[PDB]
Curated annotation (Swiss-Prot):
It comes from the Eukaryota. It is linked to Immunodeficiency 62: An autosomal recessive, primary immunologic disorder characterized by recurrent severe respiratory tract infections and bronchiectasis, due to antibody deficiency. Affected individuals have an abnormal B cell immunophenotype, with low levels of circulating memory B cells. The modification Phosphotyrosine is found at residue 317. GO terms for molecular function: G protein-coupled receptor binding; GTPase activator activity; guanyl-nucleotide exchange factor activity; RNA binding. It is found in: Cytoplasm; Membrane. Seems to play a role in the regulation of RhoA GTPase by guanine nucleotide-binding alpha-12 (GNA12) and alpha-13 (GNA13) subunits. Acts as a GTPase-activating protein (GAP) for GNA12 and GNA13, and as guanine nucleotide exchange factor (GEF) for RhoA GTPase. Activated G alpha 13/GNA13 stimulates the RhoGEF activity through interaction with the RGS-like domain. This GEF activity is inhibited by binding to activated GNA12. Mediates angiotensin-2-induced RhoA activation. Residues 6-193 form the DH domain. This is Rho guanine nucleotide exchange factor 1. The RGSL domain, also known as rgRGS domain, is necessary but not sufficient for GAP activity. The DH domain is involved in interaction with CCPG1. Phosphorylated by PKCA. Angiotensin-2 induced Tyr-317 phosphorylation is mediated by JAK2. Residues 235-339 form the PH domain. Interacts with RHOA, GNA12 and GNA13. Homooligomerizes through the coiled coil region. May interact with CCPG1. Interacts with CTNNAL1. The chain holds residues 411 to 765 of 912 of the full protein.
Length: 344
């Protein structure tokens, strides 16, 4: 006691919530995933991208539950670290990371795919509503069960920390603290994979739509690299519509992508996204960020300028947002992204 009552309370909580987590994942499989496969609402390939490796996800949380239960039955309990390391360190740690990360990365894709089906297909709408009326859902909707894996990853450090900072015996406490650290690395690697997947799917759709016919037609030297442009594997820092004032007398609606080292000024033409050099030639739509600098426009608090210190011609992009905050945010983001870039 009482470091130790708290130690036992949190070890119990870990067990009891790991069980709850297993049960929901099984509900998600039995009530949604499996019957969706059988009804074939999506081709199976699509269904697997909505629930990436649900079977094996259940298994890795299951094996964790069974070890925790095995240890609880055979002990109050001293020594839990070895069990925590057995799920979160070494080859098992790696495997749990791989499987959880596959699932979590697809969360927001899954949510949208399900939501678009419900809106579009009354059959599938009635199907989800019926599954959600069932006692085994415990009042949770399909949209609440999916995020649950990512929620649980965020919980592991909280739980392992407490246990750790309430463990008296030193070698045990090191084990627990090592497992807490493993859960932090896991959460971090998953958080990074979620962003990579979110960015990847979004940029891959932008690649499909990207029209490069003008950069190919240009024999302007500065645009010869972007031939050939492939934004697919780049980091999408921020994006949004802005109005682009090529002059005081010519405004161009543009959708701009701030990647990690390029600024892309895209023209929306129906579904397509164009990179038009259009300029009074001389103002280009794809710009290297290494040299970028933003500035306020006093006559217009919604506007800003972007200039490239490397542009021997200099070469002002006057862009305007719908609110002051939003321009403020564009300037902050541009500056900070450019600020990261090393110089030769």
């Amino acid at each position: 006691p009482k470091s130790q009552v708290k130690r036992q309370e949190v070890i119990s909580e870990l067990l009891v919530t790991e069980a709850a987590h297993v049960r929901m994942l099984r509900v998600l499989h039995d009530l949604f995933f499996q019957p969706m496969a059988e009804c074939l609402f999506f081709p199976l390939e699509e269904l697997q991208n909505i629930f990436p490796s649900l079977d094996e996800l259940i298994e890795v949380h299951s094996l964790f539950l069974d070890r925790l239960m095995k240890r609880r039955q055979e002990s109050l309990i001293e020594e839990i670290g070895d069990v925590l390391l057995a799920r979160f360190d070494g080859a098992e740690g790696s495997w749990f990371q791989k499987i959880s990360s596959r699932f979590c990365s697809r969360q927001s894709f899954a949510l949208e795919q399900l939501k678009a089906k419900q809106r579009k297909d009354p059959r599938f709408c009635a199907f989800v509503q019926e599954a959600e009326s069932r006692p085994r859902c415990r009042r949770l909707q399909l949209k609440d069960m999916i995020p649950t894996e990512m929620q649980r990853l965020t919980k592991y450090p909280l739980l392992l920390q407490s246990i750790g900072q309430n463990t008296e015996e030193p070698t045990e406490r090191e084990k627990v603290e090592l497992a807490a650290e493993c859960c932090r690395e896991i959460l971090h690697h998953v958080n990074q994979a979620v962003r990579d997947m979110e960015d990847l799917l979004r940029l891959k759709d932008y690649q499909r739509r990207l029209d490069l016919s003008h950069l190919r037609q240009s024999s302007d030297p500065m645009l010869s690299e972007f031939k050939n442009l492939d934004i697919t594997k780049k980091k999408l820092v921020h994006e949004g519509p802005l109005t682009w004032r090529v002059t005081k007398d010519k405004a161009v609606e543009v959708h701009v992508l701030l990647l990690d080292d390029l600024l892309l000024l895209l023209q929306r033409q129906d579904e397509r996204l164009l990179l038009k050099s259009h300029s009074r030639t001389m103002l280009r739509p794809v710009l290297r960020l290494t040299s970028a600098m933003t500035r306020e426009v006093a006559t217009d608090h919604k506007a800003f300028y972007v200039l490239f210190t490397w542009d021997q011609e200099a070469q002002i992009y006057e862009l305007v947002a719908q609110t002051v905050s939003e321009r403020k945010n564009w300037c902050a983001l541009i500056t900070e992204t450019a600020g990261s870039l090393k110089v030769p």
